[PDB]
Ligand binder design. Structure first.
Ligand code: HEM
Ligand code: HEM
Ligand SMILES: [Ca+2]
Ligand SMILES: [Zn+2]
Ligand SMILES: [Zn+2]
Lengths: 106, 106
């Protein structure tokens, strides 16, 4: 999928996690975020279209996804342990990573 | 790219790391591995073609890539520190993760 569609998936899944009824639901929503983040890594965002594929900016963009995937991954483990409230808090905390990339590159 | 082309990227770059002359080369080879592992995550491997997209097998498969990406990430930071031998050793440890997935799903 393209960057916009993956971003939509990330957004929608945050809301799913916020309203989730149990740990199993939070876990699979986080797994879907992890996939969307991985699939997004390959993208060239509009703001960087004229930069080299290997520019510092493009490499920084890709790093943001590495970080996001790690954080989603850790949160998924909290849900796997049945810690629903903790997983939900960790999902909310992800927004701070979302924000950092957007302020730079969106 | 498809699953096999990404596997080829993983394999070629591991060889590059083994023969690399400086940290920057190692770091860039690792970044390309991390991208290939991210793109492979979406795949359905032939051995699991008949299972549910949400079967324990397919989730275990995607989890293999989450683990691999985290290890690749950590190794990239070692190279970023200029620690070439350490990053080479870390890249070598990656092979245990390659092998675990292959033994199950290859
Ligand atoms: C889970 C955290 C995140 C959420 C919830 C999120 C959400 C969104 C949403 C809803 C959009 C609007 C685009 C659309 O779908 O129409 C967007 C755009 C965008 N996001 Fe994110 N995002 C997240 C993380 C990130 C990260 C980590 C990066 C970079 C590493 C990033 C880069 C971008 C860029 C470049 C756009 C503009 C895309 C375009 O204009 O085509 N986002 N994001
Ligand atoms: C550690 C790094 C890895 C390396 C160096 C590597 C290398 C390879 C190579 C050389 C092939 C032959 C494919 C081709 O024709 O190009 C292959 C196939 C395959 N690998 Fe990996 N691999 C790695 C990690 C993984 C992981 C982590 C998984 C699962 C989580 C995985 C799952 C598979 C599967 C299912 C195939 C067979 C695909 C098919 O037959 O279409 N690999 N790998
Ligand atoms: Ca609910
Ligand atoms: Zn894990
Ligand atoms: Zn990092």
């Amino acid at each position: 999928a393209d960057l916009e569609d993956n971003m939509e998936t990330l957004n929608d899944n945050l809301k799913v996690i916020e309203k989730a009824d149990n740990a199993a639901q939070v876990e699979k929503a986080l797994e879907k975020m992890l996939a969307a983040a991985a699939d997004a890594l390959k993208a060239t965002p509009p703001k960087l279209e004229d930069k080299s594929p290997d520019s510092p900016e493009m490499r920084d963009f890709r790093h943001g996804f590495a970080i996001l995937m790690g954080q989603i991954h850790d949160a998924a483990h909290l849900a796997n342990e049945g810690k629903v409230k903790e997983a939900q808090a960790a999902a909310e905390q992800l927004k701070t990573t979302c924000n950092a990339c957007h302020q730079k590159y969106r």
